[PDB]
Structures are given as C-alpha cells and as structure tokens.
C-alpha cells in the first residue's frame, strides 16, 4: 500500500507561533526516512503553501477565519486527490484546526469512515460557544452533521460539508473539557473515553470497545487525528496546550499498534507539535521523537519486532 | 450543600519544619476561588491558631505529646460544630496527626463513619511501637476501638475517645509499612489495598471493592484523609516522607472522582504539604497544584468535563 | 533455606567500560545486610576472578568471545556447586552474556528448570545475526537447544550445552528486538509479553499467564535472569542500553512479589547494572536501590508488609 506525507505548516488555527514549524521538525528527525524502512511505499507530498488572507477580521469572536478557511480547504483539496489514489494520507500539523480540510477530504473519497480522535481536547466548539475564538478548538463542530446550523456561517468555511456524525467517531484522552463542549458530546451521545475510563478499563479494554463501537456492525476505513497533547506533558511536552495526567508513551503506542493491526487504517494526522515551546531542546526531542515513533507504529512497527518475510536470518 | 474550609497549620506530629505553611501554600493556589465555582456553596473558616504548651516533655518516646493533644482537641471542636450544620468540613494540613481530632470531631455528628484512608503509611504506630516519636506516625492508633488501652495513656489525649473499629477503615496506597503496624493491620483484620493490590487489581476494581466493603451493607458519611505522599514522589515531591512506586496523579484523582460520584462526601484531609521541602520551587508548585486538583475532583470537576444544568450552551 | 551472592564484574559481554563494577555497588548500596534481615540464610562467595584471555581475536563478528567463554565456564562451575548444595543462587552481573553460565550452572543441578526472563531485550542473537559482536545480547542463543547447531561453534564455549527448549522460557518487557531475533522467536513459538501485551494485559494478568505456561503441568525450578534495562529508564537509568516505554517500578516489584510467592524461586540474576553511565550520582543510587529493592522482593519483601512470625507486638 501507499503512503503520502502531506505538510500542513499552519498556525492560525490558535495563538501560539510554532506550530507551522512542526513538519520541518518531524522530517528533521527522519520521518519519512524511518517510513521507507516499513512494508509501505512512501511519498512525500512536500509542504503546502498557504496563501495569508490580507484584512482577516474577526468572526464576532472567531480568530483568522478567512485564513483558516482556505488554508483547510486547499488541502482537503490535495488529500481528497491522493486517498482518489487509493494511497493513506498522513498529514503534518501546525494545529489541529487543519483536521476541518484533512477529514473532508478524506470523506469525499471515503464516506463511510470514522473518526478515532486521540486527544486530550474534544475540539468540539461551535464559533459561538468559545471563550477564544482559537478554531484550532472548533475543528469537530464544522465536521458533524448533527451540528449544522446550529452557529452562523463563518467566512471562508462556506465549502465545509458536515461529514460526518456523532456515531462515526470517538475520543480517547478527554481530560480538559469546556463546559459548552461537555453539553454537546453529553446531548449529542457521542463516545468517548476520558482519562477516567481509561484509568477505570485499561487501554486494552477501551480499544477493544472503540472498534466494535466503530465497526461492530460495518467494517470501514478509519481516520485517526492525533492530538500529540493527548500524551502527558512528560512525553510531549513540546506543545501548546499541555494538560497534566495524560495517555502515557506506552498507551499512545498501544492505540497506533491495534489500529494498525485493524488493517483499516486510510487517513492520519500528526498535530499540534510546536518546536518552539520546548523548555529545553531535549523536551522537543522527547516530542518529535514520540510523535515520530507512533507515526512509525502506526504503519507496522510493532515493540515486539519485525522481521522481513521470506528471508531465513539462519 | 456546604462546604467549609479549616486551616490547621500545625507540624509538631513530625521533625520537619514547614507543613504549618500547607494551608497557606494551597490558598495562595486559589483553592478557595476554584471551588466556589462548584455547585458547593464555600466558607472559609480561616486557619486556627494553636496555643504551644511550654515544657511539653517527650511521653517515653513520643514528642510533643501535649501541643499535639491540645490542638487536636481544639480542631476536633470545630469539625464537631460545622459537622452540626451539615456542613462538609474539608481540613487543610500541616502534618497528618491532625487527623486525630478531625476524624474525632466528626465522629461526634456522625458515628457511622468510615475512613478512606490514602497514604503510603498505615499511620497506626502505637505510643509503644514507634522508632521515632513522631505522632504523624500514630494518628490511627489512637482512633481505633480495638487500640484502645494496649497503650498507655499519652499527656494531652485524653479527650480522645476512640470513635471508630478496624471494620470501619480501609487503606489505599500503602506500601512503606512498619513491622509492628503490619502486625496490627494483620491481627485486627484491617482492610487495605497496598500498591500490590492496586498493581495487581487496577485502580477501578479497588475503587469497586472498597466500596462494597464500607457501604455494602449501610451507606453512610464518608471521611476521606489523603496523604498527599500516597502518589508517588514524581507528582508530590513536596512532602516530608516520599516513598517511590507510589499512585499515580491519574489514579489519584479517579479515587476522588469516584468518591463524589458517592454523593457520601462527609468529611475531607489534604495533609503533609511542606511548601519548603521542594527541591525547586516548580517541585512545590507540582505538590500544591496536584492537592488543589484532587480537592476539586472531590468536589465535583470531573476529568470528562462540567458544565451548568439549565444552560443551553447552544 | 540459603542464599548464596555470587560477584560476576565481568564486562567483555559489551562495548561500556563500568557494568564490572556492578557488584561492588549493589554490596556498597547493604544488598548482603538487607537480605540476612529476611527469612533466609545468606552467604556471600565474593566476587570471582576473571582471567582474562591474551590475544582475544574476533570470531567473525563476535568480540572476546574466548574471555566471555571462559568466564561463564567458570561461574557454571560455581552455580553448579551451590546449586548442588540446595542453596539459592544470586548472581551479580556486570553485563547479561553472564547468563549463560549462571542457568548452565543452575540447569546441571536442575534440568528441569524453566526462564523467566525480564528485559527490554530477547538477546537471542546468534553469532550469525549480531550487528554487533557483543555477546551480551546472545546469552539465550548459546542456551536454546533449538537453536543447537545453527551457528559455527565459537573459541570458548565448547563446555556449554544448550539445557533450555523454547518452551521452558518467557521474555517480560520486551520492547527493542532486532530483526533477526524477531524472526528466531516468532519461529520457535516463543511465549513472550512485550510491552504492548502488559499494557493489553495489564502486569498482573501477564504473571498469571506465564505461570500456567510454565508450571501448569508440572511444578518446577524457576531461574529469574532479570535485566535492569527491562524497567523504563526513569527508573533503571545507569545501563547500557536504556529503551524508552519500559517496564514501571511497581510492575517490577509485581513480577518479584510473584515469584517469590511461588516458593519455586531457584537462580536470579541481576544484570546491566552500570555505576558509570548514570548522568548524576542520583541515577545511580535511582538505579542501585530499585534493583536491591527488586532483590530482596524475590525472597520475601512485601509492599504491604513484614511482621516475624511468632512475635505478639501487642
Ligand atoms: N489544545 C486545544 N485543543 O486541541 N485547545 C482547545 C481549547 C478550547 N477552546
Ligand atoms: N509520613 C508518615 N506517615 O504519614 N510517616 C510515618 C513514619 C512511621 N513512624
Ligand atoms: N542491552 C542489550 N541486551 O540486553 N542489547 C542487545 C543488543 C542486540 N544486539
Ligand atoms: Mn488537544
Ligand atoms: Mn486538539
Ligand atoms: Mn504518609
Ligand atoms: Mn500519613
Ligand atoms: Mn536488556
Ligand atoms: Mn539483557
């Protein structure tokens, strides 16, 4: 099967500068490389160019909604061109606000997917119930179906077509939820498994009942966005909004293992790693290396080995 | 329901200088801001002031008998009055001997209690068995009913009345137990969940079981007294006795999660926070910062979200 | 029943000058005083003498291979001897090729014996599949009968015999296995639990598994060989080859607590120990006191408690 890495270098998506450093960072520390050494053929998309909306005013309080707007559906464009190609698209945050284009995408050519949302955020914000108007906060709520017309229009999203509903995805990691946020995923009976189920099931459990909750009845292809802030601040500290008490090394990897395994896996998204906001330069080495490394598991490298078949190493 | 916050700024139950400034360090963190925005209605009730008796000689080996005595006796009055106005009373520590007269006060009101008791220590040394005089070491000793007499009496403890049996407590944590304590959890038949049996069960299953075990049969007020150092060193270093392979800050604060969920939070101790024994002021800052987060987590701040009944955030 | 210490400052099994200077470290750090504290017997051999062979040429690829073949002949001689005694052997590594020898030993006294390996790594290599010379990482190799034949005979180890099948051993925490090892275990049908099936598992259910794998039918001899670096490096940080997402502090002391439970505790082995690879004096002491504390876990130490039998502390 076929790889295709595709750079999103944004940042508009929240205020923090960094994020669109993310891409050089992951391929400084030989992502693509690491890739070639799989069972995968791996092409490099390069990095998009996002051309900067002059006089981006504000959305009564969305942020850069313009720039956002077109940055997201350029590249829903090009991912919408490659998953055509039958190849697995991996996309390279800046911010999660990029997820908007990166699903859709992907959707257009698949609309039966589902979504395995690892973070420590829901990202479920509607432009009117944000204390900011951060969209990097907001990317799920211009995805779901069920959410339509339930907040003005906002310039420069006109193109987005809800998705995807409440029942196609699930969350792993919640741990820092807004209030608004709460009262939707609650009212809309979307699944998820906060830090809390995690603790009380164990990672095991809780894969096992995301899949059969996903594909229990229908096998289809799957779409994991990762929230590198999904892993606690010992292991990913390197990102904007760390939230202590986090998914461990080990669990992150655990999850990129089964949905390896699943043989399902379509599209990918590797967010919110900001080189910048390291504390030392090895805090940003932990940070691209793990992203790195579950990136890597999600394409076959498994903690127990590999070995390349049909050769005898006797 | 009430809530009421008592400082007891008191360290002679151990050697170490400092834990007299827990309440101060965990106000300064805005524990009283962040719980009035619970659905609990918050008094602070200021921190008592202890009058320190003069020429208090060492009982054999104990230290301080008498200040010790004598500040308990006036905290275990407080608790009793606010226990009397319904109110849930939430102790802010020094060290953990203050659980004498705050178990004891609220004993007065409600006599059907049972102790949570997280610590990496049993706390149950007997005037007899300690190495050190240390009555931070003997807390439970002097509340239990089958403890009562196997020990002589201690200048400044008569007051003291044991208020509750070896049925009625259950420890979660432990893991740096004394031989002379081990002997006594063994022989009264104590139940207890030391790191073993959290690695062994996961914290859920012990949650579970700790909770048929104490309210199986009758459900009544639960006095919860957290040890900050029951979770391992990494997490709340700040404290005088850390011992590794501890609670995770996850586990912790499923532990609290669930005991609101019991809606029987009846009384609360955040003890042996020691603001001056962080390596770096960061290490305090982790300490405090986690204590505050656990106290909220008793109160309702749930990991998966809050948000306002009657609110349509839409 | 007896205990015997046996010193290995052997180091020619890899690359990094220290691992020899394991022994005196764990002496220094009162592992002999600490166990005699214990139920058992202790008897401390002292350390052995290496000699070392002149004009060590490289078989091939493999290094010292006629001074790591005469060390572990040596040790066998002495394992064996204690082992003949009844007495429990410990032997203190510097680096694992000491294995060899140490369940050689142990095997010509109880062929019947099985392995419970805990490591990152399976070092499994045969000198045909090492990247690398060092045969450190092909202790196992020498001693599969499986593997009999499957490599050219190496200058120094024609004393030994391979003693174990592929069904008398079980690997926990492995989590960095070469390409080749990988092919070698997955085709002997190796039983193993890497760090993805503790996590899918959790350590408790993992020791329950391989004691019915190992002792389901028949009870027999257990030989621990216990890698440090099978613990996460935040843990075990002074060891050559440290590999992130490893075991936990309290996992470890599980797997020990387990086995000594079992009563069938015959051979240990506590290896990699480095003095000189830790970053701070604090690394090392992390270090040295965890694998003491693992230690004195396998012959009786328990986190919930020690009270002498016999001994009325009332
Ligand atoms: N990092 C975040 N999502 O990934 N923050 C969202 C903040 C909610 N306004
Ligand atoms: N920190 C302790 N308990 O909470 N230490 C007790 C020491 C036993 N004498
Ligand atoms: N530390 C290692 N095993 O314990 N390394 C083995 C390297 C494989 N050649
Ligand atoms: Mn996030
Ligand atoms: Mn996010
Ligand atoms: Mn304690
Ligand atoms: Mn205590
Ligand atoms: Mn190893
Ligand atoms: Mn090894």
């Given at each position: ?14 205020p ?100 395995i ?57 919640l ?84 949905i390896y ?35 890597l ?18």
């Amino acid at each position: 099967k076929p790889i295709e890495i595709i750079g999103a270098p944004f940042s508009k998506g929240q205020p923090r500068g960094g994020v669109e450093k993310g891409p050089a960072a992951l391929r400084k520390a030989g992502l693509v490389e690491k890739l070639k050494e799989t069972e995968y053929n791996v092409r490099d998309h390069g990095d998009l160019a996002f051309v900067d909306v002059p006089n981006d005013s504000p959305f009564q309080i969305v942020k850069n909604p313009r720039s956002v707007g077109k940055a997201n559906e350029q590249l829903a464009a090009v991912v919408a061109e490659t998953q055509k190609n039958g190849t697995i698209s991996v996309v390279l945050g800046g911010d999660h606000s990029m997820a908007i284009g990166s699903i859709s995408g992907h959707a257009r050519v698949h609309p039966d997917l589902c979504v395995i949302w690892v973070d420590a955020h829901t990202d479920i914000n509607t432009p009117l119930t944000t204390s900011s108007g951060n969209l990097h906060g907001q990317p799920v709520a211009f995805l779901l179906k069920e959410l339509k017309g339930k907040f003005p229009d906002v310039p420069g999203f006109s193109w987005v077509t809800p998705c995807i509903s409440a029942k196609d995805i699930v969350y792993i990691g919640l741990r820092d939820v807004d209030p608004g946020e709460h009262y939707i995923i609650k009212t809309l009976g979307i699944k998820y498994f906060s830090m809390t189920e995690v603790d009380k099931l164990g990672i095991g459990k809780v894969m096992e009942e995301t899949f059969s909750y996903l594909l229990g009845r229908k096998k289809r292809p799957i779409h994991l966005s990762f929230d590198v802030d999904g892993l606690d601040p010992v292991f990913t500290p390197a990102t904007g909004t760390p939230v202590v008490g986090g998914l461990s090394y080990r669990e992150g990897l655990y999850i990129t293992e089964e949905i390896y395994k699943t043989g399902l896996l379509s599209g990918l998204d590797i967010m919110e790693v900001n080189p910048t906001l390291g504390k030392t330069p090895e805090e940003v080495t932990r940070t691209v290396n793990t992203a790195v490394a579950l990136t890597l598991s999600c394409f076959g490298t498994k903690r127990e080995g590999n070995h390349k078949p049909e050769t005898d190493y006797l």
